[PDB]
Amino acid sequence: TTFGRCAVKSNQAGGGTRSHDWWPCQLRLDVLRQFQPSQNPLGGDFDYAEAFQSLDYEAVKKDIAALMTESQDWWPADFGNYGGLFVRMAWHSAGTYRAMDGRGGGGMGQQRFAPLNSWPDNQNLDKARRLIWPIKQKYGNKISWADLMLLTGNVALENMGFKTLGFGGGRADTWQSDEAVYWGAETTFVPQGNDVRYNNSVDINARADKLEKPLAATHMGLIYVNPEGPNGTPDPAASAKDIREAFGRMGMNDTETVALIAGGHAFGKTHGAVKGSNIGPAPEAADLGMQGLGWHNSVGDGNGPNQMTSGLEVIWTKTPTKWSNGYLESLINNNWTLVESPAGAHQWEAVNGTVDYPDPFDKTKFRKATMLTSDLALINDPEYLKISQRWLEHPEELADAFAKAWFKLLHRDLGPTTRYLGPEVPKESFIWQDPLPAREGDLIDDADVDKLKAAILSTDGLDVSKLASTAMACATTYRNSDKRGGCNGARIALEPQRNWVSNNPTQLSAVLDALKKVQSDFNGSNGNKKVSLADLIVLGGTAAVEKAAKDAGVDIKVPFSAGRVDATQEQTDVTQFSYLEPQADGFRNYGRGTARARTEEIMVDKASQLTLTPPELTVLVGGMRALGANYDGSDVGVFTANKGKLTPDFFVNLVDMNIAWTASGADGESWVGTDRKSRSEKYKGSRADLVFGSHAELRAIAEVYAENGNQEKFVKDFVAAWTKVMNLDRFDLKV
Amino acid sequence: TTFGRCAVKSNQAGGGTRSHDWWPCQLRLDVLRQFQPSQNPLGGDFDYAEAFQSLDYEAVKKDIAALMTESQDWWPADFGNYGGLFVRMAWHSAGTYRAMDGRGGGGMGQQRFAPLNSWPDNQNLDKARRLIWPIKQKYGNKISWADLMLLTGNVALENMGFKTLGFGGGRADTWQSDEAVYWGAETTFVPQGNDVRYNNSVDINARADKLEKPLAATHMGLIYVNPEGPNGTPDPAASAKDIREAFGRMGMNDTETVALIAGGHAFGKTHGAVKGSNIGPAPEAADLGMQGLGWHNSVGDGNGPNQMTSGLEVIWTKTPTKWSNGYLESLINNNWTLVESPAGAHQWEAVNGTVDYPDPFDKTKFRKATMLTSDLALINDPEYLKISQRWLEHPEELADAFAKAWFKLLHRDLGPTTRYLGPEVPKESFIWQDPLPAREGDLIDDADVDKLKAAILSTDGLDVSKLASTAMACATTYRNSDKRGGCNGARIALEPQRNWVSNNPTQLSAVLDALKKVQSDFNGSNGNKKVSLADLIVLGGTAAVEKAAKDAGVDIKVPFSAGRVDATQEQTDVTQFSYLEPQADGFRNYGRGTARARTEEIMVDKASQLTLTPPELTVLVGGMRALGANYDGSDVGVFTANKGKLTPDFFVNLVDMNIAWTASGADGESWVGTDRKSRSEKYKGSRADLVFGSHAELRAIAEVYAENGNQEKFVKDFVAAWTKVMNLDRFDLK
Ligand code: HEM
Ligand code: HEM
Numbered sequence A: 001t002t003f004g005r006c007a008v009k010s011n012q013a014g015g016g017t018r019s020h021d022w023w024p025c026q027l028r029l030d031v032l033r034q035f036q037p038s039q040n041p042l043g044g045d046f047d048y049a050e051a052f053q054s055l056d057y058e059a060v061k062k063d064i065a066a067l068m069t070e071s072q073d074w075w076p077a078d079f080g081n082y083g084g085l086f087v088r089m090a091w092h093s094a095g096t097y098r099a100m101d102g103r104g105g106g107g108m109g110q111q112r113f114a115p116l117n118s119w120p121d122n123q124n125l126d127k128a129r130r131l132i133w134p135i136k137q138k139y140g141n142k143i144s145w146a147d148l149m150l151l152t153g154n155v156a157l158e159n160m161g162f163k164t165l166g167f168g169g170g171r172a173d174t175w176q177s178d179e180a181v182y183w184g185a186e187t188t189f190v191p192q193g194n195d196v197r198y199n200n201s202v203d204i205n206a207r208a209d210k211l212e213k214p215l216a217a218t219h220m221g222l223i224y225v226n227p228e229g230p231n232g233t234p235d236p237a238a239s240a241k242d243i244r245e246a247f248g249r250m251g252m253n254d255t256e257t258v259a260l261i262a263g264g265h266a267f268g269k270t271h272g273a274v275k276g277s278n279i280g281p282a283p284e285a286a287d288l289g290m291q292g293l294g295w296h297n298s299v300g301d302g303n304g305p306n307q308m309t310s311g312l313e314v315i316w317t318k319t320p321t322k323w324s325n326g327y328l329e330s331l332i333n334n335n336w337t338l339v340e341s342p343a344g345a346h347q348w349e350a351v352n353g354t355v356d357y358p359d360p361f362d363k364t365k366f367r368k369a370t371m372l373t374s375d376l377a378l379i380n381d382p383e384y385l386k387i388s389q390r391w392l393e394h395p396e397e398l399a400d401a402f403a404k405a406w407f408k409l410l411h412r413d414l415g416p417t418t419r420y421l422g423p424e425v426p427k428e429s430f431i432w433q434d435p436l437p438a439r440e441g442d443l444i445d446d447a448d449v450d451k452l453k454a455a456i457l458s459t460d461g462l463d464v465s466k467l468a469s470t471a472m473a474c475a476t477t478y479r480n481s482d483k484r485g486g487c488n489g490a491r492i493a494l495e496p497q498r499n500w501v502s503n504n505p506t507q508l509s510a511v512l513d514a515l516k517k518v519q520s521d522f523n524g525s526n527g528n529k530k531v532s533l534a535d536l537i538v539l540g541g542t543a544a545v546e547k548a549a550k551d552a553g554v555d556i557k558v559p560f561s562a563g564r565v566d567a568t569q570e571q572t573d574v575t576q577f578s579y580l581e582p583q584a585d586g587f588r589n590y591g592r593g594t595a596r597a598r599t600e601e602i603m604v605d606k607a608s609q610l611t612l613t614p615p616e617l618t619v620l621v622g623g624m625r626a627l628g629a630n631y632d633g634s635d636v637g638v639f640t641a642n643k644g645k646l647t648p649d650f651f652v653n654l655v656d657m658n659i660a661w662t663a664s665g666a667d668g669e670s671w672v673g674t675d676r677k678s679r680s681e682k683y684k685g686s687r688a689d690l691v692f693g694s695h696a697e698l699r700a701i702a703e704v705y706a707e708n709g710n711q712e713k714f715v716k717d718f719v720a721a722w723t724k725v726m727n728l729d730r731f732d733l734k735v
Numbered sequence B: 001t002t003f004g005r006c007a008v009k010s011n012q013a014g015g016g017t018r019s020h021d022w023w024p025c026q027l028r029l030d031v032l033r034q035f036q037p038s039q040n041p042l043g044g045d046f047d048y049a050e051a052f053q054s055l056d057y058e059a060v061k062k063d064i065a066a067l068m069t070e071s072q073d074w075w076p077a078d079f080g081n082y083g084g085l086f087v088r089m090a091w092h093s094a095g096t097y098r099a100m101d102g103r104g105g106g107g108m109g110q111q112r113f114a115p116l117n118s119w120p121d122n123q124n125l126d127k128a129r130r131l132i133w134p135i136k137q138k139y140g141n142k143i144s145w146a147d148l149m150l151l152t153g154n155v156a157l158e159n160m161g162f163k164t165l166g167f168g169g170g171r172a173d174t175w176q177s178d179e180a181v182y183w184g185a186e187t188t189f190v191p192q193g194n195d196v197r198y199n200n201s202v203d204i205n206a207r208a209d210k211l212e213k214p215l216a217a218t219h220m221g222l223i224y225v226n227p228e229g230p231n232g233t234p235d236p237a238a239s240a241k242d243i244r245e246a247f248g249r250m251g252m253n254d255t256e257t258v259a260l261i262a263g264g265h266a267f268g269k270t271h272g273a274v275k276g277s278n279i280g281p282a283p284e285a286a287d288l289g290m291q292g293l294g295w296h297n298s299v300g301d302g303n304g305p306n307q308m309t310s311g312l313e314v315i316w317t318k319t320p321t322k323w324s325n326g327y328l329e330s331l332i333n334n335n336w337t338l339v340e341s342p343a344g345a346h347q348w349e350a351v352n353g354t355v356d357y358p359d360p361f362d363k364t365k366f367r368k369a370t371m372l373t374s375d376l377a378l379i380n381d382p383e384y385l386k387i388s389q390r391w392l393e394h395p396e397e398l399a400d401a402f403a404k405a406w407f408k409l410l411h412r413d414l415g416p417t418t419r420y421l422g423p424e425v426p427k428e429s430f431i432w433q434d435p436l437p438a439r440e441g442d443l444i445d446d447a448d449v450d451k452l453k454a455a456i457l458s459t460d461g462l463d464v465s466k467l468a469s470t471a472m473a474c475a476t477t478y479r480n481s482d483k484r485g486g487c488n489g490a491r492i493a494l495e496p497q498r499n500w501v502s503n504n505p506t507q508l509s510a511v512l513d514a515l516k517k518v519q520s521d522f523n524g525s526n527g528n529k530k531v532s533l534a535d536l537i538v539l540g541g542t543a544a545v546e547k548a549a550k551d552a553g554v555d556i557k558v559p560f561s562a563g564r565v566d567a568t569q570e571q572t573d574v575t576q577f578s579y580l581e582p583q584a585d586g587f588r589n590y591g592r593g594t595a596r597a598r599t600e601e602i603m604v605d606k607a608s609q610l611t612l613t614p615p616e617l618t619v620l621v622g623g624m625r626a627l628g629a630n631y632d633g634s635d636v637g638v639f640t641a642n643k644g645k646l647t648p649d650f651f652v653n654l655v656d657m658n659i660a661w662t663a664s665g666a667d668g669e670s671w672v673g674t675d676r677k678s679r680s681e682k683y684k685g686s687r688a689d690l691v692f693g694s695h696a697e698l699r700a701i702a703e704v705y706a707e708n709g710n711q712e713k714f715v716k717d718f719v720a721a722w723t724k725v726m727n728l729d730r731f732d733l734k
Helices: A048-052 A057-068 A083-094 A125-142 A145-159 A236-249 A254-264 A326-333 A373-379 A382-393 A395-411 A446-457 A464-475 A505-522 A533-550 A574-578 A599-609 A614-626 A649-654 A687-693 A696-706 A711-726 B048-053 B057-067 B083-094 B125-142 B145-158 B204-210 B236-249 B254-264 B326-333 B373-379 B382-393 B395-414 B446-456 B464-475 B505-522 B533-551 B574-578 B599-609 B614-626 B649-654 B687-693 B696-706 B711-726
Strands: A337-340 A346-349 A357-359 A362-367 A659-663 A670-675 A681-686 B337-340 B346-349 B357-359 B362-367 B659-663 B670-675 B681-686
Touching (some): A048 A125, A057 A125, A057 A145, A083 A145, A083 A254, A083 A395, A125 A145, A125 B696, A145 A395, A236 A254, A236 A373, A254 A326, A254 A373, A254 A382, A326 A373, A346 A373, A446 A533, A464 A505, A464 A533, A464 A614, A464 A711, A533 A711, A599 A614, A614 A687, A614 A711, A649 A687, A649 A696, A659 A681, A670 A687, A687 A696, A696 A711, A696 B125, B048 B125, B057 B125, B057 B145, B083 B125, B083 B254, B083 B395, B145 B395, B236 B254, B254 B326, B254 B373, B254 B382, B254 B395, B326 B373, B326 B382, B346 B373, B382 B395, B446 B505, B446 B533, B464 B505, B464 B711, B505 B533, B533 B711, B599 B687, B614 B649, B614 B687, B649 B687, B649 B696, B659 B681, B670 B687, B687 B696, B696 B711
Antiparallel strands (some): A357 A362, A670 A681, B337 B346, B357 B362, B659 B670
């Protein structure tokens, strides 16, 4: 078979040519159908946080520590200690994170599913996960796989003599492969897997800063970089440039990068004992006897001294089970020669070095010092060299930076600190956690909420359209992958969001100033009760939705949950927040897509990050149009003569056959609706508008809301979806 | 570019290389994740039957009838009447049904989604669905698209002079493409789309009866056969062989087949006015301006006299808006010559015939008679000719056969008669409805249930394992695609099921005889109360599950719903039921895979037909193993020392790393589990067993049930899944 095709064509269980085969360019809704409660064996009403709070956390860590030195005959431990392997397992779990889109990381425990379970860089971590299973079996639902993989690495470091800052749990497991992540477009893995992401450039120094966005690895199938140098060329200088690019795409700076690599490579070793032709299929391609494992090695028992993982055979320190400064000392104080491992791969050896690096299965036999090309990178770049030279003589500074970087790596996608669970959460707050202050004052009650809604709606310069638009602009910065963004913090009032062109800065300024007058009037006239700007932004949109429903003939309660706080600019990092800036926004008819992602594809991707189903996406868009909630107040998509009233007029008018739609410019972004009988232009629409009348599955939902009869249902469903979106980041509240 | 690949590679919304790309042979669970309640815009709570029964049904029909003659300028009506178009719409919705697997048909309204919305043979039915949308708009949730597409064809026949038997509603809408159906493996549509289904044979006579199972169309993208003959060869005799094969695979016999074709082709016309180069992309490939329509025709306004659908230009009768015998009269009385339509397709013309066939847009202009190659088939086969000859002389017989066959076409995937809604459900019971009687005596209550459970669990020949096995064997015949099978009717006790090898006939006979003893003891000694064998089979299994739970240390009420009836053998056609016989049954460790599908694939397919989610499939298999419920009573997969007790031992032992699993048979079906320490063989497993420890998503669920502390959860989840499966056919309780 060619790529993506099985040689046997199944006739069961979804076998056969499928719609995506015939029409591969059509928009797919798959990413809005993942992670559904039916699919979760634990039930939709399972509360991980509540289960983890009953965990005997201390006993978990004790049992992990014990397991580190209990070698299992099916995968013997190097030096009698799985620590190194476990550190690698946790670092690869967390290490797929990309800062730009916030995807990857360890927070969904996705290493245990395709494709990550079978990436080349994850070779033999199937064995690592299997070794820790008995811990999961003992503790059951009270620790997730997601938390356990990372806790295991953290405990491993501590038991090998490196004290970490602490740990937070809170990562609920997921139950299917996350097929929403764009890992690249290549049709091959490392050693290939990177023509597309370099746009066919092969000049390894020149291309290193030209890696396709948002990717954070130099080949499909790798965590960050190729350990044998760029495209396998053993040039440490050029490897350094790759490392900078890749780690930068993961949200790490130079200090963090050197700390992580020199910290991690204090421990363990690589494996490259036998040629790769001896290694069987990865877990997703292996036979049923492998029972979820892969890479079966036919030499010997395939393990112990015959272990083959990367094809390199490097032991960095003389004490691979104990924290030390041996990595930097070897790196800088040895002379390096290029040699081949037993499997044939490029590495470096100190061929006149001391013969005192221990063998992993013989306590009396030794070898010379070795390094990877990607380790030599750290003394073949001026910035990395300065850091390496400083830490060579000041290892406490390495230790400090490593502790902080390791914490950040494990917890980058955990979200706000209100998500962090367990008895050793670090007390220090860090900028990457998007910190929030404690609240000013006592919490407003329902009577205060009712008075503030009336005050907001009677304030000059505030109307239903602007209020709803502003609240949604603030809310849709949320992304579920790394739990960043949302309305808490009022970060729309801060840089960079206050200047995002998609927020219409001049309008936003006037809206916020009017909310700050409501705030000033309330605060100080209600005793100890005080209201934040964050709550007023959300309450103003809430009030607008309620009023728009009443003005459509429907009296409905629009729920509001008080208690958001206002971030400071010092808690709001410009670079980090720039990554949340939309290039197109279908809720507010802003912007457009590009060749490789169309306007409506961006919208569906955004909806996946908001955890919206297809019906919730569809009701929100149509309600936002009815509300006149475009970012600049345009009439594009505003297919209603009742603007500000919460009706399904967008749907009704979109599917009216007396309107004919035609393209207005060259790029397919703008569309005109013409009345067929009168020949007069009636409407202007965008792709975000018209996809709901074109995609067969979305149109089926559009038709529900356009049905004579479902008018009350439209309001009910809009209000439910609004409430969901406003509350996504409310981890401070429970249930 | 490459088949199945977009030239532009999106980086959003699921764009990028995907796990199914890297490992295309791996088992996929997608078919267990369809039709989820969160996807349904109506809500999970929505009850279609209740909505329909409040529908002003007569008014719907009245509005359809009026629409028929309300020509719309964007798709003008041939002869001023949309009736033929609407009949075609209905017939194509219902016409994808395959009897053998029970898939396709109109019962899910799938014509409105990919791929059916864009099949060649459904060209311009996008316009037909759009013309009826104002009816759907007016009546809302109270009539589904699925019901409305078929009702519209029904009403069209009645408003063109053809009285049907009646109609039943009840088809709830679905909300995504059904990607579980095997339509074929070809990577092209008609005019190609058939190398795989004929195994590369191009010998049109010899291959006709060799069409790949369970397919029911001669090319990918067609409803039944090619109207231009086999592979476009204009040979009516060969076309007849394809028709018999395809219609046979749809459950229709020779009389049904002629009745459907000659009945349908009373009405309307084909469209072939301009060449195919003038036609734009199908709906799934069309630009946003098309707003779900496709096949834009660039000649004139693309419509009216320029309509292009199939490429053929045939008008069968002189009165295309009114029922007549003109189809058979023309077919038999004319001399036919092969000609080209304006689009270049070949068709047949009576070149010396009368010039009295009406033009669809000009009341002063006329043409000669025409027919398709597939129409001439009916007088170029001995059995079809005999039928055509008889009905030429006795057209009432065609009308009676067409009424009956049309009713069967539209309703056979609707399920049991208890699902049929509305005021004109035909009174005649038909064998293809798998009919069921009304109940005997008064309904058992919970006191009677308690007495019966205690008797069943202490009767000669019965035990936990046997009862659980027997109840699951009867239940897993259910298939949601056409709502056939299940436990209602006690058809496991009838032919052919009572002699299926998968049911272990000698053990089944001893189980059934024991349950019939319990029945006989209860019936007649409880006044007018009577209990059915069907209730006893399910009650027995349910009681067994409850006891097995108790013995595992969990006290749980296992709910039982009484009221099933016993079917008679007269109501149980043996050929019809042969289509429910499983190739493999993973719940009971029966069977093996084929050259096309592995054992575990068949299991996931079955689970999809049961509407199971991946946790429900997993829990059931592991519980059935704990129960010792294999079809043959073997120890394969029975990884427990406590057989008959509802523990999660299957999972615990499957994931024990002290066991190494290796292949035993050449065929990949058998596996041995060896203790790594002692080197002793401990277990035998199947593929249905071991897949739960291999597939990463299934294994994640197996792990949950293997975890300390989850023994109660295992029982709870097993009981919920058991209850769901036992009750799948209980449409009488709705
Ligand atoms: C430029 C970045 C890095 C590269 C290219 C790299 C490459 C590698 C390779 C090739 C192996 C050997 C796998 C095998 O054959 O078993 C490995 C092992 C390992 N790496 Fe890294 N690494 C990087 C960063 C990290 C970081 C950031 C950490 C953790 C903080 C880490 C911790 C480890 C550990 C502990 C092992 C030893 C595993 C064992 O003993 O089995 N590395 N690394
Ligand atoms: C051997 C089986 C059959 C074949 C090959 C076949 C073929 C076709 C073709 C090629 C068209 C023309 C589509 C177009 O160009 O507009 C058509 C139209 C039509 N068919 Fe059939 N047909 C079959 C069976 C049936 C059946 C079973 C029915 C209904 C009971 C039916 C009812 C209709 C009607 C009413 C039209 C006219 C549509 C209009 O007026 O727009 N056909 N058929």
